[PDB]
Amino acid sequence: RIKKISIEGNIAAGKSTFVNILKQLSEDWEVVPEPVARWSNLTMEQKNGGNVLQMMYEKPERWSFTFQTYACLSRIRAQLASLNGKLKDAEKPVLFFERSVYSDRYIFASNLYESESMNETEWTIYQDWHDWMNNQFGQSLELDGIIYLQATPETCLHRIYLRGRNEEQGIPLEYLEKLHYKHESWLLHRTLKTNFDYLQEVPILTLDVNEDFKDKYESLVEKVKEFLSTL
Amino acid sequence: RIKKISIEGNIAAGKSTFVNILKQLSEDWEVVPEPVARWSNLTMEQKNGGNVLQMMYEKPERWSFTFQTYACLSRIRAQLASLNGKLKDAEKPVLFFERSVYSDRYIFASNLYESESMNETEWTIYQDWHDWMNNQFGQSLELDGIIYLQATPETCLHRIYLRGRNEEQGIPLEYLEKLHYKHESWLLHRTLKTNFDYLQEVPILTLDVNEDFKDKYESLVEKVKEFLSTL
Ligand SMILES: COc1ccc(-c2nc([C@@H](C)Sc3nc(N)cc(N)n3)c(C)s2)cc1OCCF
Ligand SMILES: COc1ccc(-c2nc([C@@H](C)Sc3nc(N)cc(N)n3)c(C)s2)cc1OCCF
Ligand SMILES: COc1ccc(-c2nc([C@H](C)Sc3nc(N)cc(N)n3)c(C)s2)cc1OCCF
Ligand SMILES: COc1ccc(-c2nc([C@H](C)Sc3nc(N)cc(N)n3)c(C)s2)cc1OCCF
Ligand SMILES: O=c1ccn([C@@H]2O[C@H](COP(=O)(O)OP(=O)(O)O)[C@@H](O)[C@H]2O)c(=O)[nH]1
Ligand SMILES: O=c1ccn([C@@H]2O[C@H](COP(=O)(O)OP(=O)(O)O)[C@@H](O)[C@H]2O)c(=O)[nH]1
């Protein structure tokens, strides 16, 4: 009865900015930052999170499997914690996930494989480890909906340029372009098949977020509220 | 209501030999062979397994973390599948598991960390997951007892010969010696402080298997029967 909705989009699309706006508008609405975002900048996980982040950057062909598995594991734990810990005293509870286990596999992991940073065996083991590990533990992480925050690679690039973090100034447009295409095919075009038949029919809301919405988001929030009523 | 017993033992101590003997003595007795034993002679799991096993051997400092995670995932599934699909119509059901998720971590994975085949981050990540894979999936697999087929490292090396796998003739005594000590600390002196609380009080039966037993196994089985009557 808690509604689970994932916020999808490219790097620097505005997902953190969006969910940080959404969380303050209602008591019935909670948020789960993706752990990779927390790793980027201390617990057992945060330490391993930092190290593997750096290792991955320094050698993706060595670390893409290690990182993807841990990133997904951590997300499932961060999400299950929120399902069981939050929104019991809410009449219309909504839980907004920053990305999803589907993003983990069908965007990031899938891209690393296609970039040759995972070999066939690693990608094959990862999919098995994902197919199985979600279809019980994170069985009822099933999402009620997806909000797709669509921004072009250039916007995202400028929002990386604008965010100003030293470590990401070097992310190349080509990669952003690569991630954009994977999102479009899953979320906009719907060609990409998955091993999770319900996702073929789960309702998506696309929002166009090229235009800065920081001072001006009501049309966007109006669209979210309207989307929630159809679920 | 199925009693769960792990048979634990160094490389070629005689575990396969034993379990297969035990499987024949009662329609109530069934065995779960270990994933890696399967791989060491097809399904996505077999292919993935054969590949990861070969790369492990070639370059353990690259493939230990991956191998270990897939080994343990695989074991967890098998021991689930065996609880579901075996000994349904048994009065006194007993499942003998060939090794356990505990030898996975505290013998093998630990040894590979100790021999610098996993770094700290790999090892803490492994331990982080292991803790959770079991908690989320592996609850029903908790052990009623352990049987330690205890043999000298010299015995096992000799036994590798008798088994005649060309591949295996390269296994050094110093490796067996490290695995042996870890078996002793864990299962004899009961020094190893596992994170899993119920293990401190799990019954252990320790069987000197240094003599050949293939055609002279009655007395070992008698101890198993006594042990099993105490659980
Ligand atoms: C020098 O090359 C690289 C440097 C860094 C990367 C990284 N990609 C990423 C993410 C986009 S992968 C990711 N992010 C998430 N947020 C979640 C998830 N499961 N996976 C990093 C955090 S670092 C990827 C790199 O290479 C791609 C080669 F094609
Ligand atoms: C050149 O160095 C190595 C060569 C081979 C190994 C291997 N260990 C193993 C297993 C004993 S590790 C294992 N076996 C199992 N049966 C189960 C499990 N969870 N882990 C191999 C199949 S290959 C390990 C090696 O490094 C040992 C470092 F401690
Ligand atoms: C093909 O080359 C690349 C592909 C992707 C990247 C990415 N880097 C990043 C970050 C810089 S990794 C990161 N971000 C942080 N904020 C902090 C930190 N320690 N590590 C992504 C999120 S994607 C970086 C790439 O290299 C460009 C500079 F080497
Ligand atoms: C420190 O050096 C070693 C440590 C461990 C080994 C091991 N090899 C093996 C087997 C030969 S791996 C194996 N066994 C099989 N039966 C089949 C197969 N494909 N791979 C172990 C079970 S342990 C071998 C080692 O040295 C090999 C010398 F090259
Ligand atoms: O409408 C927007 C959305 C985002 N940003 C900024 O652009 C950067 C990227 O946004 P965010 O970090 O939320 O993106 P994410 O990577 O979480 O998608 C941030 O520094 C934001 O403050 C902005 O100025 N206007
Ligand atoms: O009592 C025994 C136990 C084992 N073996 C031999 O030792 C080798 C290793 O046996 P097993 O496969 O049971 O070892 P494990 O399963 O412990 O690796 C095989 O050739 C067995 O035939 C034997 O001759 N007598």
Curated annotation (Swiss-Prot), chains A, B:
Keyword check for Phosphoprotein: yes
Gene Ontology terms, MF aspect: ATP binding; cytidine kinase activity; deoxyadenosine kinase activity; deoxycytidine kinase activity; deoxyguanosine kinase activity; protein homodimerization activity
Record GO biological process: dAMP salvage; nucleoside phosphate biosynthetic process; pyrimidine nucleotide metabolic process
Phosphoserine PTM sites in chain numbering: E45
Binding positions for substrate per the UniProt entry: E34, Y57, Q68, R99, D104, E168
EC number: 2.7.1.74, 2.7.1.76, 2.7.1.113
Assembly and interaction partners: Homodimer.
Protein name: Deoxycytidine kinase
Organism, scientific name: Homo sapiens (Human)
Gene name as annotated: DCK
